[PDB]
Design a protein around this ligand. Structure first.
Ligand SMILES: CCc1nc(C)oc1C(=O)Nc1nc2cc(C(N)=O)cc(OC)c2n1C/C=C/Cn1c(NC(=O)c2oc(C)nc2CC)nc2cc(C(N)=O)cc(OCCCO)c21
Lengths: 173, 173
């Protein structure tokens, strides 16, 4: 019923608690061998549940650089963030794919998931996941949640500016 | 609340609907190049939610043969089933890992998941998943659910005999 609660806990148990303790070392290995990539996994949480099929970012100010090397195969992508033509940040960035699952459940008649419940379940997914990570041992400062809703009147949104805002806070603290 | 419903739908959407349409071809490729492996993915559903940490099968009558080759990396294992010292079947076999997630949720104080609710949620996971697969296009006769509960008084159970019963039905039909 609160489908988002189970999906947050599963995403933590079967993915984040397994990948996050080895992330710092794969990043630190990249920053020796292959401007430096920042230290955390940045997780994109579009509250509209819109995740591209190829997990590929439309925004040309978010430009693919490289895959992180391995420490179970994990494909995690490093992106450069551009601002008025300038390289302004570099980080490991990806979508919270369970939001895509909520979207897909909403389309299937047998799932009992109303289309108009997507925003509420996305917000519950985000809140549950933030509460888990607040008491999570494997999170030693190695992921950041980026939750966002684009404006209601089709007014322009910059995903790159959204990401950069979060990065610059981490430089400040 | 019915956490098992969301986990069944996610397991279908984010794994089974992606792996199952390519399974027949990876199996048919193995049966040319590397006794023949049977055609379906056999999914183990222990209603006690006990899934080994190394996904490795204790029963010495279920003996690892090989990994299936690739067509996103999928590690799927081929096992030989032994009966009174004789090779009696060969299939692609694995645990429904969301049952392990139910078990783990039951251990975490913050999850709101009572230990004594594991059997009920496992049964709901199995029922939901069987209903999904009944109307599923990517299931063209390419997976089989094997649900089981060991006896209540610590009386002996054979997982190999359980698997072989299901295989021999498929030879009959
Ligand atoms: C996700 C669908 C699902 N929903 C439920 C309840 O269960 C499953 C499930 O069991 N899926 C699954 N089984 C797999 C088996 C196998 C194999 N045979 O080798 C392979 C699988 O993919 C490769 C399987 N996959 C899908 C994802 C599993 C792990 N994983 C995740 N996980 C989630 O997004 C997730 O979301 C929720 C709500 N729960 C979870 C935890 C399963 N994200 C990942 C990102 C990456 C990456 N960027 O490269 C790599 C991952 O897996 C590496 C393979 C390690 O096994 C990832």
């Amino acid at each position: 019923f609160n489908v988002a609660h189970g999906l947050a806990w599963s995403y933590y148990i079967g993915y984040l608690r397994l990948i996050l303790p080895e992330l710092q070392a794969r990043i630190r290995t990249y920053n020796q061998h292959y401007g430096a990539v920042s230290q955390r996994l940045y997780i994109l949480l579009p509250l509209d549940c819109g995740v591209p099929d190829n997990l590929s970012m439309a925004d040309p100010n978010i430009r693919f650089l490289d895959k992180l090397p391995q420490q179970r195969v994990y494909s995690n992508s490093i992106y450069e963030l551009l601002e008025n033509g300038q390289r302004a940040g570099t980080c490991v960035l990806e979508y919270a794919t369970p939001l895509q699952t909520l979207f897909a459940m909403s389309q299937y008649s047998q799932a009992g998931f109303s289309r108009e419940d997507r925003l509420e379940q996305a917000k519950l997914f985000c809140r549950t996941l933030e509460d888990i990570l607040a008491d999570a041992p494997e999170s030693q400062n190695n992921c950041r949640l980026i939750a966002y809703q684009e404006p209601a009147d089709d007014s322009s949104f910059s995903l790159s500016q959204e990401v950069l805002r979060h990065l610059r806070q981490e430089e400040k603290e």
